[PDB]
Amino acid sequence: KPILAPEPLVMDNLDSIMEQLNTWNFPIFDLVENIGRKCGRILSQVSYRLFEDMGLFEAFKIPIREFMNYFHALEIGYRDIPYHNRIHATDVLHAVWYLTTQPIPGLSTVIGGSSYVFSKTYNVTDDKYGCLSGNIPALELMALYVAAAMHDYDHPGRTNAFLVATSAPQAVLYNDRSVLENHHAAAAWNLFMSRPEYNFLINLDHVEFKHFRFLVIEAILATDLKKHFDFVAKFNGKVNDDVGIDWTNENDRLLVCQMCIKLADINGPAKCKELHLQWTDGIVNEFYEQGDEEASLGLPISPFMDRSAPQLANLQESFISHIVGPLCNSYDSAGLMPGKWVERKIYCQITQHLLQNHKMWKKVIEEEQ
Amino acid sequence: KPILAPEPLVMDNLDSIMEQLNTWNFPIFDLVENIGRKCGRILSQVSYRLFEDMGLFEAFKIPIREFMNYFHALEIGYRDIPYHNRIHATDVLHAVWYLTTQPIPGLSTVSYVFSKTYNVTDDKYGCLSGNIPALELMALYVAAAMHDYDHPGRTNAFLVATSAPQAVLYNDRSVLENHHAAAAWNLFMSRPEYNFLINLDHVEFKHFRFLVIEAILATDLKKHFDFVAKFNGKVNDDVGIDWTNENDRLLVCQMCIKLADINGPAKCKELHLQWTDGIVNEFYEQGDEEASLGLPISPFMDRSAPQLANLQESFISHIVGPLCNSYDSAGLMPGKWVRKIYCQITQHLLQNHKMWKKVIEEE
Ligand SMILES: COc1cc2c(cc1OC)-c1c/c(=N\c3c(C)cc(C)cc3C)n(C)c(=O)n1CC2
Ligand SMILES: COc1cc2c(cc1OC)-c1c/c(=N\c3c(C)cc(C)cc3C)n(C)c(=O)n1CC2
Ligand SMILES: [Mg+2]
Ligand SMILES: [Mg+2]
Ligand SMILES: [Mn+2]
Ligand SMILES: [Mn+2]
């Protein structure tokens, strides 16, 4: 019955691609081909590297075998669908790691902090640059990373609105409230608890484990796009009406973690053209599969989900303008965006990609009109 | 095989008690004895009478057989535990009906239904059923019937502390209330013999389901203070309660199902004390199980060390009292003009509070 991590445990010939993890535009699809399509190891392998990179194994006496057992079971439970698969989960984990360990221009380190981890890739001795992992305790950072790995577990390639409209068993079970996000969290925790071979958290005390579980759940549930505007408003409030992010306040740290996983979840439009376009193919393929089923069931086809009338450019442009753009703006306004001091001015790779990708789609719109 | 209602759908031997439904201190335990303790028909029989009394069957072309099928299946699924049983569910349904149908002094009256027990000659009175559309009222009543379905006689905190499958399933968030709503809707949808809502259109049905869920989830005591604050907010704000606003009517409905859920301390001594025995018995059963494990026994749950009077007094002072005060302040409490108002409900709550204080002093 229990799914255990294959004898090799850590694969050895992937070192060249794995060295590139500390870039924003990590070539994740090249990693897929390297490892093997539907080999089912990308997540556990990347998880190992990133946890190793942060010294999380040592920080929480995590047994590597149980870690790799759980993460393999987890990744096996991601379905082979175009977008919400184990490759997306790996991508999201890489993004929250990048966002939390890379230099942020003019970020202050929290007074009185000794407990925290730092990436081996964070070798700078600058006072002009900080990173989130210096302001967020290791337990909370680990919670965020595990959440990213878990966050879309057993996704069926349909939206919540679809599950609700068709009274799917999941929607009835969760009373039409964050159906998939509740499922991802609940199923992934159930998986964890089902076997002692999965108990990589054996050395947290009872209090720590309970707090960890709470944080993981809050992070996963924050991925419901239905609550996107509420989260952005609430964060904007703390930066505009309030004294800003109190890194000493547990609730402010939670809210940064949630904004962080949200940005990571929908990072595609903020990547280089190549990655962005590959992820686009994935998501629109899931949408059309839903459109097919909606039609066959006599329900009206949802916007942007008709293969016959795609409106691809409109989907992309509006998604960037209404969702991703405001989220990046909000996150930048708090000063959490990785970036570089120019020669003061800040150069920000993430918002620059988002601008270029937005331009690109606005051009297709004119040409098609 | 589905659970269907007993062939003679309406019982005929309960007429002396069922006419007394339009009193606050409905003798519900006498009805239990009339029907038979574990006969399992109390909820469906009361539901029939109240829906009949409101003309809801006619208002929504509800087929009575499917209605009675569902409500019997529902009541069968309430467990035989001391408090969170089908008798509590019936009690809660009776309370929301009473609160929404009975005369409220100086309430402005505004499709809608009215109780047969309500005369329209007295202008100095209104009732909530005149300000809340029939669909929303029906949602509230069905919610009350469903609201504690398949209760295991343990608190959410217990289920969370012991990583019960339900707590893992609902991520520690309103575990029981999510379960009650989800299990009761699953039951409804499982059989066409249960589809008493067949004649709502798609829009109405969706809105109905949303309202029912919101009412059930509002019974989580963890959210008690938020609801009371929010309601006090709308009352003490400008324009007060806007009966034309849907979100203002939802909060009224939620405050109504909340008051009904914990109505016991606002009943006559006799009823109050019977319900007390029930709840403390569930608490001690949980206390037992907590000690069977290595968990510390929760406050007021040790039978070998009871703080009954403290439990009662603090529950009234911290929970019930503020809720009644809030609800009275909005002017929604049933009562009689005697420029003075006599209010049976707040009167009972005061007396029961006094009673427990006295008991605390004697020690
Ligand atoms: C990374 O690329 C993308 C990733 C996603 C989505 C779109 C992407 O690009 C367009 C996406 C969109 C979505 N609904 C929306 C749709 C349809 C269009 C728009 C304009 C806005 C929303 C919220 N809904 C409900 C949804 O589940 N998703 C999945 C995540
Ligand atoms: C109407 O009678 C009663 C009905 C209930 C409860 C108490 C009653 O009166 C004692 C009750 C109380 C409870 N917790 C509390 C306890 C224990 C004590 C106090 C002071 C306050 C709360 C919120 N919790 C967690 C709980 O589940 N319940 C069940 C509903
Ligand atoms: Mg998701
Ligand atoms: Mg309850
Ligand atoms: Mn995702
Ligand atoms: Mn109840």
Residue A193 contacts B, CB cutoff 8 Å: yes
Indicate which of A175, A183, A209, A218 best probes the interface with B, i.e. most B CBs within 10 Å of its own CB.
Answer: A175
The Å distance, Cα B358 to ligand 6 centre, comes to: 28
- How far, in Å, are A167, A353, B99, B216, B259 from residue B255 at the CA level? 28, 50, 11, 11, 6
Structure tokens at B4: 């269907």
SS (H, E, C) A10-72: CCCCCHHHHHHHHCCCCCHHHHHHHHCCCCCCHHHHHHHHHHHHHCHHHHCCCCHHHHHHHHH
Neighbouring-strand partners of residue A340? A347
Which residue type, as a one-letter code, is found at position A222?
Answer: A
Both tokens of B189, joined, read 């949808």
Is A189–B209 a contact, with Cβ atoms under 8 angstroms apart?
no
Q: Which of B72, B84, B94, B353 is an active site residue?
A: B84
Task: Give the torsion through C-alpha atoms of A181, A182, A188, A189, to 10 deg.
Answer: 140
Chain A hits for B182, Cβ within 8 Å: 172-175
List residues near ligand 1 (CB under 6 A): A 159, 225, 266, 268, 279, 283, 304, 315-316, 318-319, 322-323
Name all domains of chain B by residue range, CATH numbers in brackets: 14-362 (1.10.1300.10)
Give catalytic status of residue A84 as yes or no: yes
> What are the residues whose beta carbons fall under 8 Å from the beta carbon of B96, sequence distance 6 or more?
B140, B141, B144, B256, B257, B260
**Inter-residue contact B257 to B144 (CB < 8 Å):** yes
3-class DSSP state of B82: coil
In the structure encoding, which two tokens stand for residue B225, read together? 């203070």
Which two structure tokens, joined as six digits, stand for A211? 């707090």
| Of the candidates A127, A141, A66, the residue with the CA atom closest to the CA atom of residue A98 | A141
Rounded distance, CA A136 to CA A115, Å?
Answer: 9
Task: State the angle between helix axes of B246-261 and B134-146 in degrees (0 to 180), rounded to the nearest 10.
Answer: 30
Catalogue the long-range contacts made by A80-85 (C-beta closer than 8 Å, 24 or more residues apart).
A80/A38, A81/A155, A81/A156, A81/A157, A81/A286, A81/A289, A82/A157, A82/A281, A82/A282, A82/A283, A82/A285, A82/A286, A82/A289, A83/A157, A83/A279, A83/A282, A83/A283, A83/A285, A83/A286, A84/A152, A84/A155, A84/A157, A84/A286, A85/A155
Q: Report how many Cβ contacts below 8 Å link chain A to chain B.
A: 41
Query: Which candidate, B260, B228, B149, B247, places its Cα nearest to that of A175?
Result: B149
Inter-chain touch A213–B172, beta carbons under 8 Å: yes
- Of the candidates B168, B181, B217, which has its C-beta nearest A190's C-beta? B168
Residues contributing to the annotated binding site of B for AMP: 84, 148, 261, 312
Q: Is the CB of B352 under 6 A from ligand 2?
A: no
In angstroms, the CA A119 to CA A110 distance is: 17
Q: How far apart are CA B234 and CA B249, in angstroms?
A: 11
Among the listed residues B10, B96, B108, the one whose alpha carbon sits nearest the alpha carbon of residue B54 = B96
- List, in sequence order, every residue forming a beta bridge with A129; answer none if it has no partner: A105
